[PDB]
Amino acid sequence: DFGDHVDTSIFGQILEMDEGDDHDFSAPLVLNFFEQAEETFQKMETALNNKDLPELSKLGHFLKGSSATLGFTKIRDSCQLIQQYGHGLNVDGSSEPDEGVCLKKIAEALASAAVDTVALHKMMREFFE
Amino acid sequence: MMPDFGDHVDTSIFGQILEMDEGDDHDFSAPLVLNFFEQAEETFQKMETALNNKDLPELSKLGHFLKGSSATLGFTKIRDSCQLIQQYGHGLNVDGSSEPDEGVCLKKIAEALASAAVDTVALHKMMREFF
Protein backbone atom coordinates (compact mmCIF):
# COMPACT_ATOMS: atom_id res chain seq x y z
CA ASP A 1 0.00 0.00 0.00
CA PHE A 2 2.10 2.86 -1.38
CA GLY A 3 -1.04 4.72 -0.35
CA ASP A 4 -0.71 8.36 -1.39
CA HIS A 5 2.28 7.92 -3.68
CA VAL A 6 1.01 5.56 -6.42
CA ASP A 7 -2.32 5.35 -8.25
CA THR A 8 -3.20 1.83 -7.17
CA SER A 9 -5.01 1.10 -10.46
CA ILE A 10 -2.39 2.48 -12.87
CA PHE A 11 0.64 0.54 -11.61
CA GLY A 12 -1.27 -2.72 -11.21
CA GLN A 13 -1.38 -3.02 -15.01
CA ILE A 14 2.37 -2.27 -15.22
CA LEU A 15 2.95 -5.21 -12.88
CA GLU A 16 0.32 -7.44 -14.54
CA MET A 17 2.39 -7.26 -17.73
CA ASP A 18 5.25 -9.02 -15.93
CA GLU A 19 5.70 -12.75 -16.42
CA GLY A 20 6.93 -14.40 -13.21
CA ASP A 21 9.01 -13.14 -10.27
CA ASP A 22 11.69 -11.81 -12.65
CA HIS A 23 10.08 -8.37 -12.36
CA ASP A 24 10.87 -8.36 -16.02
CA PHE A 25 8.89 -5.47 -17.53
CA SER A 26 7.97 -3.21 -14.59
CA ALA A 27 11.48 -2.99 -13.09
CA PRO A 28 13.02 -1.84 -16.43
CA LEU A 29 10.26 0.76 -16.73
CA VAL A 30 10.59 2.35 -13.27
CA LEU A 31 14.41 2.09 -13.19
CA ASN A 32 14.45 4.38 -16.23
CA PHE A 33 11.78 6.69 -14.82
CA PHE A 34 13.91 7.46 -11.77
CA GLU A 35 17.09 7.89 -13.80
CA GLN A 36 14.98 10.09 -16.12
CA ALA A 37 13.34 12.15 -13.36
CA GLU A 38 16.73 12.80 -11.69
CA GLU A 39 17.93 14.54 -14.86
CA THR A 40 14.69 16.53 -15.28
CA PHE A 41 15.40 17.95 -11.82
CA GLN A 42 19.07 18.82 -12.47
CA LYS A 43 17.59 20.82 -15.34
CA MET A 44 14.69 22.33 -13.39
CA GLU A 45 17.40 23.32 -10.89
CA THR A 46 19.54 24.92 -13.60
CA ALA A 47 16.44 26.64 -15.03
CA LEU A 48 15.37 28.10 -11.66
CA ASN A 49 18.90 29.51 -11.26
CA ASN A 50 18.31 30.48 -14.84
CA LYS A 51 15.03 31.88 -13.44
CA ASP A 52 13.10 30.69 -16.51
CA LEU A 53 9.36 30.21 -16.39
CA PRO A 54 9.08 28.88 -19.99
CA GLU A 55 11.82 26.27 -19.58
CA LEU A 56 10.44 25.25 -16.18
CA SER A 57 6.84 25.13 -17.42
CA LYS A 58 7.99 22.64 -20.09
CA LEU A 59 10.04 20.39 -17.79
CA GLY A 60 6.93 20.23 -15.60
CA HIS A 61 4.61 19.37 -18.48
CA PHE A 62 6.95 16.54 -19.46
CA LEU A 63 7.64 14.75 -16.18
CA LYS A 64 3.88 14.91 -15.58
CA GLY A 65 3.33 12.79 -18.69
CA SER A 66 6.13 10.30 -17.94
CA SER A 67 5.06 9.97 -14.29
CA ALA A 68 1.32 9.79 -15.08
CA THR A 69 2.24 6.65 -17.08
CA LEU A 70 3.36 4.82 -13.92
CA GLY A 71 0.61 6.25 -11.69
CA PHE A 72 3.09 8.29 -9.61
CA THR A 73 0.37 10.84 -8.90
CA LYS A 74 2.50 12.33 -6.11
CA ILE A 75 5.21 13.47 -8.52
CA ARG A 76 2.57 14.21 -11.18
CA ASP A 77 0.61 16.80 -9.18
CA SER A 78 3.82 18.62 -8.26
CA CYS A 79 4.85 18.80 -11.92
CA GLN A 80 1.29 19.90 -12.76
CA LEU A 81 2.08 23.02 -10.73
CA ILE A 82 5.53 23.45 -12.28
CA GLN A 83 3.69 23.70 -15.61
CA GLN A 84 0.78 25.82 -14.32
CA TYR A 85 3.01 28.32 -12.51
CA GLY A 86 5.76 28.20 -15.14
CA HIS A 87 2.90 29.32 -17.40
CA GLY A 88 2.26 32.30 -15.07
CA LEU A 89 -0.93 30.74 -13.67
CA ASN A 90 -2.00 30.43 -10.03
CA VAL A 91 -3.61 27.57 -8.05
CA ASP A 92 -6.97 29.35 -7.68
CA GLY A 93 -7.01 29.92 -11.46
CA SER A 94 -6.00 33.59 -11.73
CA SER A 95 -2.92 34.55 -13.70
CA GLU A 96 0.17 35.19 -11.58
CA PRO A 97 1.66 38.54 -12.79
CA ASP A 98 4.56 38.41 -10.32
CA GLU A 99 7.50 36.42 -11.73
CA GLY A 100 8.99 35.91 -8.27
CA VAL A 101 5.77 34.45 -6.84
CA CYS A 102 5.93 31.82 -9.58
CA LEU A 103 9.64 31.01 -9.13
CA LYS A 104 9.03 30.64 -5.38
CA LYS A 105 5.98 28.40 -5.70
CA ILE A 106 7.86 26.42 -8.36
CA ALA A 107 11.02 25.93 -6.29
CA GLU A 108 8.66 24.98 -3.44
CA ALA A 109 6.81 22.50 -5.66
CA LEU A 110 10.02 21.20 -7.28
CA ALA A 111 11.50 20.49 -3.86
CA SER A 112 8.27 18.76 -2.83
CA ALA A 113 8.48 16.79 -6.10
CA ALA A 114 12.18 15.96 -5.60
CA VAL A 115 11.17 14.60 -2.17
CA ASP A 116 8.41 12.11 -3.05
CA THR A 117 10.87 10.90 -5.69
CA VAL A 118 13.40 9.94 -3.02
CA ALA A 119 10.46 8.65 -0.97
CA LEU A 120 9.11 6.47 -3.79
CA HIS A 121 12.68 5.52 -4.74
CA LYS A 122 12.94 3.83 -1.32
CA MET A 123 9.38 2.41 -1.39
CA MET A 124 10.22 0.83 -4.77
CA ARG A 125 13.58 -0.58 -3.60
CA GLU A 126 11.83 -2.30 -0.68
CA PHE A 127 9.02 -3.55 -2.96
CA PHE A 128 11.06 -5.05 -5.82
CA GLU A 129 13.84 -6.74 -3.84
CA MET B 1 39.89 0.32 -3.44
CA MET B 2 39.35 3.65 -5.23
CA PRO B 3 36.03 5.49 -5.86
CA ASP B 4 35.97 8.86 -7.63
CA PHE B 5 32.82 10.14 -5.90
CA GLY B 6 34.36 13.45 -6.95
CA ASP B 7 32.21 16.34 -5.78
CA HIS B 8 29.75 14.29 -3.75
CA VAL B 9 31.96 13.01 -0.92
CA ASP B 10 34.81 14.39 1.21
CA THR B 11 37.55 11.79 0.69
CA SER B 12 39.26 12.72 3.96
CA ILE B 13 36.15 12.25 6.11
CA PHE B 14 34.78 9.07 4.52
CA GLY B 15 38.35 7.69 4.62
CA GLN B 16 38.28 7.33 8.42
CA ILE B 17 34.73 5.91 8.32
CA LEU B 18 35.94 3.10 6.04
CA GLU B 19 39.15 2.58 8.05
CA MET B 20 36.96 1.76 11.07
CA ASP B 21 35.65 -1.43 9.42
CA GLU B 22 37.12 -4.95 9.07
CA GLY B 23 37.88 -6.04 5.50
CA ASP B 24 35.30 -6.74 2.80
CA ASP B 25 32.43 -6.61 5.32
CA HIS B 26 32.56 -2.81 5.46
CA ASP B 27 31.11 -3.97 8.73
CA PHE B 28 31.02 -0.56 10.44
CA SER B 29 30.47 1.84 7.55
CA ALA B 30 27.92 0.03 5.35
CA PRO B 31 25.47 -0.07 8.33
CA LEU B 32 26.01 3.55 9.40
CA VAL B 33 25.78 4.79 5.82
CA LEU B 34 22.76 2.55 5.12
CA ASN B 35 20.88 4.21 7.97
CA PHE B 36 21.86 7.71 6.85
CA PHE B 37 19.63 7.49 3.78
CA GLU B 38 16.93 6.06 6.08
CA GLN B 39 17.36 9.16 8.27
CA ALA B 40 17.89 11.66 5.44
CA GLU B 41 14.79 10.35 3.61
CA GLU B 42 12.78 10.91 6.81
CA THR B 43 14.23 14.40 7.43
CA PHE B 44 13.20 15.52 3.95
CA GLN B 45 9.61 14.30 4.29
CA LYS B 46 9.39 16.57 7.36
CA MET B 47 11.14 19.50 5.67
CA GLU B 48 8.58 19.30 2.86
CA THR B 49 5.73 19.26 5.38
CA ALA B 50 7.35 22.07 7.38
CA LEU B 51 7.96 24.09 4.21
CA ASN B 52 4.34 23.49 3.18
CA ASN B 53 3.35 25.27 6.42
CA LYS B 54 5.89 28.13 6.21
CA ASP B 55 7.74 27.16 9.40
CA LEU B 56 11.20 28.76 9.19
CA PRO B 57 12.32 27.68 12.73
CA GLU B 58 11.54 23.98 12.30
CA LEU B 59 13.15 23.88 8.86
CA SER B 60 16.12 25.61 10.52
CA LYS B 61 16.39 22.88 13.16
CA LEU B 62 15.98 20.09 10.60
CA GLY B 63 18.82 21.58 8.57
CA HIS B 64 20.99 22.04 11.66
CA PHE B 65 20.39 18.36 12.45
CA LEU B 66 20.89 16.82 9.03
CA LYS B 67 23.93 19.05 8.49
CA GLY B 68 25.72 17.41 11.41
CA SER B 69 24.70 13.86 10.51
CA SER B 70 25.72 14.39 6.88
CA ALA B 71 28.82 16.42 7.79
CA THR B 72 30.09 13.43 9.79
CA LEU B 73 30.07 11.21 6.67
CA GLY B 74 31.74 13.80 4.42
CA PHE B 75 28.63 14.27 2.26
CA THR B 76 29.58 17.84 1.42
CA LYS B 77 27.08 18.51 -1.37
CA ILE B 78 24.22 17.42 0.89
CA ARG B 79 25.69 19.09 4.01
CA ASP B 80 25.93 22.49 2.32
CA SER B 81 22.32 22.46 1.12
CA CYS B 82 21.34 21.93 4.78
CA GLN B 83 23.62 24.77 5.89
CA LEU B 84 21.44 27.05 3.72
CA ILE B 85 18.26 25.52 5.13
CA GLN B 86 19.19 26.03 8.79
CA GLN B 87 20.88 29.40 8.28
CA TYR B 88 17.86 30.71 6.37
CA GLY B 89 15.66 28.89 8.86
CA HIS B 90 16.87 31.83 10.94
CA GLY B 91 16.41 34.55 8.29
CA LEU B 92 20.10 34.84 7.34
CA ASN B 93 21.62 35.31 3.88
CA VAL B 94 24.34 33.12 2.31
CA ASP B 95 27.01 35.64 3.34
CA GLY B 96 25.52 36.34 6.76
CA SER B 97 23.60 39.38 5.50
CA SER B 98 20.14 39.79 7.05
CA GLU B 99 17.20 38.29 5.18
CA PRO B 100 14.03 40.09 6.41
CA ASP B 101 11.78 38.61 3.69
CA GLU B 102 10.13 35.21 4.30
CA GLY B 103 9.28 34.49 0.65
CA VAL B 104 12.93 35.10 -0.26
CA CYS B 105 14.10 32.55 2.30
CA LEU B 106 11.46 29.92 1.49
CA LYS B 107 12.47 30.05 -2.19
CA LYS B 108 16.20 29.64 -1.53
CA ILE B 109 15.41 26.89 1.00
CA ALA B 110 13.26 25.00 -1.52
CA GLU B 111 15.97 25.55 -4.12
CA ALA B 112 18.63 24.24 -1.72
CA LEU B 113 16.41 21.47 -0.32
CA ALA B 114 15.47 20.28 -3.82
CA SER B 115 19.21 20.25 -4.56
CA ALA B 116 19.90 18.21 -1.44
CA ALA B 117 17.09 15.82 -2.42
CA VAL B 118 18.92 15.22 -5.70
CA ASP B 119 22.44 14.50 -4.46
CA THR B 120 20.87 12.12 -1.94
CA VAL B 121 19.47 10.04 -4.81
CA ALA B 122 22.64 10.49 -6.86
CA LEU B 123 24.86 9.40 -3.99
CA HIS B 124 22.45 6.63 -2.98
CA LYS B 125 23.31 5.10 -6.37
CA MET B 126 27.05 5.87 -6.15
CA MET B 127 27.11 4.16 -2.75
CA ARG B 128 25.22 1.07 -3.89
CA GLU B 129 27.75 0.96 -6.74
CA PHE B 130 30.50 1.27 -4.12
CA PHE B 131 28.93 -1.49 -2.01
Author numbering:
A (entry chain B): 45 to 173
B (entry chain A): 42 to 172
Describing publication, verbatim:
If the HK incorporates a REC domain (REC-1) is denoted as hybrid histidine kinase (hHK), and the first His-Asp phosphotransfer event occurs in the same polypeptide chain. Then, HPt protein containing a phosphorylatable His shuffles the phosphoryl group from the phosphorylatable Asp in the REC-1 domain to the phosphorylatable Asp in the REC domain of an RR (REC-2) in two more phosphotransfer steps. In fungi, the HPt accepts the phosphoryl group from REC-1 domains of various hHKs upstream of the signaling pathway and forwards it downstream to REC-2 domains present in at least two conserved RRs, Ssk1 and Skn7. Also, we have obtained the crystal structures of Ct_HPt alone and in complex with REChHK6 bound to the phosphomimetic BeF3−, as well as the crystal structures of REChHK3 and RECCa_Sln1.
However, to assess the impact on protein stability of the residues involved in salt bridge formation, we produced single mutants E82A, E89A, R158A, R169A, and a double mutant R158A/E82A. A thermal shift assay revealed changes in the thermal denaturation temperature (Tm) only for R158A and R158A/E82A which dropped to 54 °C in comparison with the Tm of 61.5 °C for the WT. Also, SEC analysis for the mutants showed a change in their elution profile in comparison with the WT, with a second peak eluting at a lower volume. However, SEC-MALS analysis with mutant R158A identified a single monomeric species in solution with a MW of 19.9 kDa similar to WT. Thus, the salt bridges involving R158 seemed to play a relevant role in the stability of the helix bundle. We determined the structure of the mutant R158A, albeit at a low resolution of 3.4 Å, observing two molecules in the AU with no differences in the helix bundle with respect to the WT (rmsd ~0.6 Å for 128 residues) but in the crystal packing. The absence of R158 changed the electrostatic nature of the interface and allowed the approach of αE in both molecules to a distance of ~4 Å between Cα of A155–A155.
